[PDB]
Symmetry: C4
Subunit: 389 residues, 4 copies
């Protein structure tokens, strides 16, 4: 758990190198003031190059391990022989790999890639400003002012803005500006593509539900469906989006493995069947088997779950909604059933027409178990089929 | 239902603050002329900060509740001590959250996010123009003209255009222009990504049908399918796209819950089975059970639904098309069947070869019920199996 | 079929209006030279406004029907009272709707939307150049040269390039340039989004096959699969992509309706079962029923379809590949089977171990029919079960 | 295998032509110095135009075959009559087609299209620089310097940067700059769209797993699932992503054909059933049949695979994890089972309650075979049902 601070320190030291080595390349009078920090960074990299193998393609790390920057700056080598100090930025590839490895589970990978690209773009802009120094004619200008001008020019170039108040004056400056132009176009396209990918998946669930509703309502309007049924279906879809975020229970449950799905079924509806008087005198295997076959169904307000006098082969367990039960002819209210309650128990023990109708008060979700699955389950458990009969 | 006008008023007051507080920061001679509106806005925010809890992360609302802007403007504090008045824009986050909460169901969420980003970009452009005032050297220029120049510069920057006729002249102006450059690149990328996400889902159904047709025709061309069958399949796909928008009936129906699917089946084909002479003397449960197993099939023009003399185990209910019936050898036209009619009733009561052939005149859609599902349904209802036999 | 030329003429006349009315607004000395074309266009629009109801939201058409442009130009009304002539561009909305309606089936809808946006952008650029005339100070410059300058400026603005050699000089010019800046950013974002949507679906099948291969090979590498089996699976996937474009036969077939799927099965494998000696003395219903249950399987080179001495319950019909049959111990080659041939016929008439092994020479695709479906089919046709026994 | 070097040579020769013919159009004093290379390229194209038919829409190849460039340059034809030499770039279309044909399987097609577009954009930029020469006024400037200026201008235009330090001065230059402006906007939009398409599919598997986890956890949080079960499910999903990259075994296996799936089952679990004492004295057909019905299930740490005293109808084969077995009441550890081992063998030979419980130590993956599939398999093989009983 203590490797996170070490990785953060590696981030800090590699950013310090990325900001320092091109500035020191530009200004030779910068090696000595930051010499202690430079040697500290070098020894940190040396001590980190074996530490990567502990608690874990490695060519960039090896290239950025040995200190080329110290030799070229101490010897005051010319620019072609000092451009080899730029190998310290090979640490950035391994840093980005480690960052994607450590915090991918906590941060959206598209957003993480976008922030990594933004940081790399800022570092590249600093490097391009330093390169702009390398070709700008010498002048009696403060280092801060000329760095501000170079950073302004490179930020104008990368963002494809092109004010034109800072333009090349020498052929080498023109070649460098063409290269930076192409690089800035490439990274601006990368930024826009990353933003587009992030945005297109920002509301994936909402868009999925929207197209789900649109296709259903278009199909219904083709089939000449009355506005009442259309409004009821739209209200059901709105309730589904507001409660389950438009996710069907069956699709989510089947995507889980057998033991996790069994535990989920336990926690969702084990109490509601534990209240059930019929299923006592039975082992936990029978309970798990019957609740693994509970098919959820959502009933809107004013909908008839069943009709009295009809055959009936289903048993319903209320999960989160509230539902009312009326008489056979639906004049008087027998009782009120809420979460944790169940009805239709008479259908399991006897094959006779139902006694009373039950209608949903509001949007209620309940689990329906047909007689086929119940008979299949009790067939595997003859000892349970005795007392129920 | 009266909270919509209150939310609209909150929108208006927060936009007024967003347009006012930076302008008043720029021009000190603006606090007094808009003092009544300022105090009205302040009292509206104070009265709204408890109203959010009624009829419903809250840190921005609390930050934007108390009036920092009134204190700094009355005391004429310097710019570093008056930048704290910008906390009133924390109301914008809650405003955007409320806007996404209230009208997401009525407006495409991608388009809603795009418009919200456009409005925020306009407000940010106004703020950036005000900041451009804050660093522009003082001059004897009208407020309108200098605001027009600043807004022109910031709109040029944000849209990544960069005319260059308005460029920084001071180092602080250069730093501010770099910051605004990065911000404008970021928001232009955001705009382009939002537009790309909106466009990619503009014709999701049409693109789905297009790739559906393309894969089918490529597979058929691989299998050496004659141009006649290819043209017939293409015509069927065109009819499907023009009627059902390329949506299969089974996929749409199975995506609905059991009661809503039952009601949809009711409205689609309850009349066509109510005409059916065979199914009278039966309860509504049997009707719902049989029509819940009706598998829709689309028959193109000139296609043979069945052949006379063949065994036959299907019954078809015309839904929206028109179909013709010929003789066994197909010389004479027996009759014409249209929407609401049905044929194949003889197969349900007797297992004998069919008497006559039936061929589709135009593109007709009808529901086919095989003998297996019918026998399964009537087995559950022995009382219905009596009169049918 | 003669409405296509009329729609093309409407396209030409509305483009002529879009290019003419702003130019004539800019140059008052342009109404008379194009007066015959103007009145011809007006009468064409008048005669077309009832023709839309024949052989087929209509508010833009009604607005663009009556000739506001003729009145304002003849009366030489000022700019605020002549801006009402721009209602003729309301014809563009109906033109775009008709274009999307007529040729959506022949041209990729994303590409069609991109071209429509490009044309609208060109027309808008012409209009913006005309507006640039409307605010440019009067000068002794040729109309062609000033139009070229205005079009250059507007094309620079819309493409977010911003050279800056043409910049506003008056406050009204600055406001117009800000508006055109925002519009150009919006339409450039629209162009980029349309291009991104078009590109993301350019290789949908290829990308689907690529991710299909990648997930399979990653899962196999996780399960420690030898390089031989990995190479065989990669070769099979390459063959599948090169022949069927990565589309599984079952997925394509099940996406078709029952009669079209039956006809496809007819054309694919009716000859190969017509050669089959066992299935003669049988009606076409039995043939269609058995071939509707043919499950396709792809066998790579060197793969064992079955093994001699094993029980065996499958019959295979070669479709497009070439396959060889060896002895029971696989020393001698019994024969060579090609497209249109079949083997495994002994398993249908007798439940005994197979006599010889059969191995694929090259990548061969054949249809496998297990004994379960065959027994189910022949059970429905007892008259066919006689001679086969 | 020797056609790859020929295709590379064609690439080199067509790039040489693309860089040469516009430069020679600009500078008439360039035909003679590169005459041997020109005639070598011409003869290479002539010898390649029949070679395309060997070891394989052809109109561009025929157009670019015959040497129009040699005639116009030798005759020193004017620009309108020498623009016909640009037909040599028709070779680029066939080159791109061949490149997409040869290395699509080895390189991501989106990335390949992006690189092809980048190369075409560089060639077009060179051509646009040459066209900029064609309209630039003659001056005593070195060819290198003026080419650098033209390339700088065209790169500024295409990347939508627009510095403005190089602007048109003549009407023809203005028209050319407008055309290049539109072309640069189009290709920049193409680059951004290609980058967006590449990025959106960079982490398709990771994004799929992320949305899989998000929908599951949202559904569970809706159903009031305790943080313990939520954490267990999150840990299982993390393990699944880290091992199988979030791919379910069933989905991957069913996407393979029957023989390849059979071979995969062989290699995955043939040894673990070869250790099994019960299944000896059985043929390979029975082994393949039983292992083709092995349903994989993933059990997290601390999870109960079965419970002692319960009926039990499953047999589990450990594949990659490690699992422990305890007593019936779970006080003592019976043994330790690892990869290649199996338990639950008693359920196959006798229908009695299980003797001991088995719980997973760490995340273990094992294949569960229920009694239904085993009974179905052994029913087809009566000779195997003897010794097992
Ligand atoms: C991203 C922002 C990047 C900024 C790079 C600035 C490089 C020039 C630094 C000049 C330092 C300085 O003294 O600035 C003086 C003015 O400084 C400022 O206005 C702010 C300086 C601190 C940086 C603020 C950055 C905010 C984002 C002028 O001298
Ligand atoms: C006007 C146009 C001016 C020129 C523009 C040139 C633009 C170039 C954009 C290049 C973008 C490269 C993006 C690479 C992303 C990346 O990480 O790719 C990966 C690199 O490893 C590979 O991804 P893949 O899906 O395996 O293939
Ligand atoms: C988005 C459009 C934003 C525009 C910001 C304009 C800021 C400067 C306002 C100058 C007011 C004024 O008197 O303009 C005078 C000219 O005003 C105009 O031409 C139009 C003024 C009204 C705004 C029209 C906006 C149309 C969109 C010149 O003085
Ligand atoms: C040339 C390049 C110059 C620099 C460009 C810098 C660009 C930066 C673009 C930043 C875009 C941020 C978009 C954030 C969208 C958003 O609402 O994200 C959300 C913020 O909460 C998070 O979304 P997620 O999917 O949970 O992750
Ligand atoms: C998209 C291209 C749009 C071009 C708009 C040109 C507007 C100015 C027309 C000047 C006509 C003229 O005489 O041009 C003269 C020069 O014209 C040219 O160079 C080409 C004129 C024809 C248009 C060619 C367009 C090619 C695309 C100079 O006077
Ligand atoms: C720097 C930024 C400067 C400002 C940029 C402002 C950009 C605005 C872009 C507006 C794009 C609108 C696209 C509308 C597309 C369209 O046809 O939408 C449709 C219009 O009807 C509606 O589509 P939906 O999916 O039903 O919602
Ligand atoms: C993509 C990069 C394209 C560059 C096109 C350069 C065209 C002008 C060539 C001038 C040659 C020359 O002598 O350059 C001299 C300066 O050359 C340089 O600085 C580098 C020349 C070699 C090209 C380097 C390209 C790196 C990417 C000045 O004279
Ligand atoms: C500010 C705006 C300035 C004007 C911008 C004009 C932009 C034009 C972009 C044109 C992009 C064309 C992309 C064509 C891609 C391609 O290869 O298409 C294919 C060409 O064959 C066809 O693809 P499909 O999916 O069969 O349809
Ligand atoms: N007053 C009530 N309280 C609780 N449950 C009831 C009441 N009336 C009817 N039910 C249930 O509703 C069912 C409808 O008919 P059943 O025969 O299935 O058995 C009935 C009971 O399970
Ligand atoms: N003239 C007709 N009018 C209506 N239906 C018919 C006519 N002729 C045949 N049919 C139907 O077409 C069916 C074809 O053969 P069946 O034996 O299934 O029973 C037949 C009737 O259901
Ligand atoms: N020489 C051959 N020519 C054609 N088919 C053959 C030949 N030898 C074997 N077969 C087929 O291969 C099958 C393998 O064993 P069966 O008993 O299924 O019946 C066999 C025949 O159908
Ligand atoms: N000590 C052990 N070593 C290996 N396997 C065991 C051990 N104890 C129990 N099992 C297995 O675990 C199973 C649990 O109950 P069964 O009756 O299915 O048969 C048991 C054996 O297959």
């Amino acid at each position: 758990t203590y490797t996170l601070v070490w990785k953060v320190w590696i981030l800090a030291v590699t950013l310090y190198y990325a900001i320092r080595i091109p500035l020191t390349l530009v200004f030779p009078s910068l090696f000595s003031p930051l010499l202690p920090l430079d040697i500290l960074a070098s020894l940190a990299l040396i001590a980190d190059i074996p530490l990567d193998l502990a608690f874990e393609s490695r060519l960039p790390d090896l290239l950025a391990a040995l200190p080329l920057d110290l030799l070229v700056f101490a010897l005051h080598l010319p620019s072609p022989l000092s451009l080899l100090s730029l190998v310290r930025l090979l640490k950035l590839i391994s840093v980005q790999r480690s960052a994607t490895r450590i915090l991918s589970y906590r941060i959206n990978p598209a957003l993480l890639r976008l922030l990594s690209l933004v940081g790399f773009i800022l570092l590249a802009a600093h490097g391009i400003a330093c390169g702009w120094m390398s070709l700008q004619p010498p002048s009696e200008n403060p280092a801060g002012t000329r760095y501000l001008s170079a950073f302004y020019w490179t930020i104008t170039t990368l963002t494809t803005i092109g004010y034109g108040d800072i333009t090349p004056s020498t052929p080498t400056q023109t070649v460098y500006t063409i290269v930076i132009e192409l690089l800035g176009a490439a990274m601006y396209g990368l930024v826009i593509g990353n933003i587009a990918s992030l945005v297109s998946k920002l509301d994936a669930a909402k868009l999925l539900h929207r197209e789900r509703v649109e296709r259903v309502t278009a199909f219904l309007s083709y089939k000449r469906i009355s506005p009442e049924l259309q409004r009821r279906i739209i209200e059901y879809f709105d309730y589904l989006w507001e409660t389950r975020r438009g996710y069907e229970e069956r699709e989510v449950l089947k995507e889980l493995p057998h033991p996790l799905r069994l535990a989920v079924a336990m926690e969702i509806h084990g109490d509601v069947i534990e209240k059930v008087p019929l299923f006592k005198g039975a082992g936990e295997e029978f309970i798990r088997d019957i609740i693994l076959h509970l098919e959820p169904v959502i009933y809107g307000p004013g909908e008839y779950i069943i009709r009295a006098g009809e055959m009936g082969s289903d048993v319903y367990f209320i999960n989160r909604g509230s539902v009312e039960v009326l008489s056979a002819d639906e004049k008087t209210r027998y009782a009120i059933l809420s979460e944790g309650q169940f009805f239709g128990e008479m259908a399991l023990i006897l094959r006779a027409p139902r006694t009373a109708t039950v209608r949903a008060r509001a949007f209620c979700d309940l689990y329906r178990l047909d007689k086929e699955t119940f008979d299949r389950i009790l067939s595997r458990y003859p000892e349970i089929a005795a007392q129920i009969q």
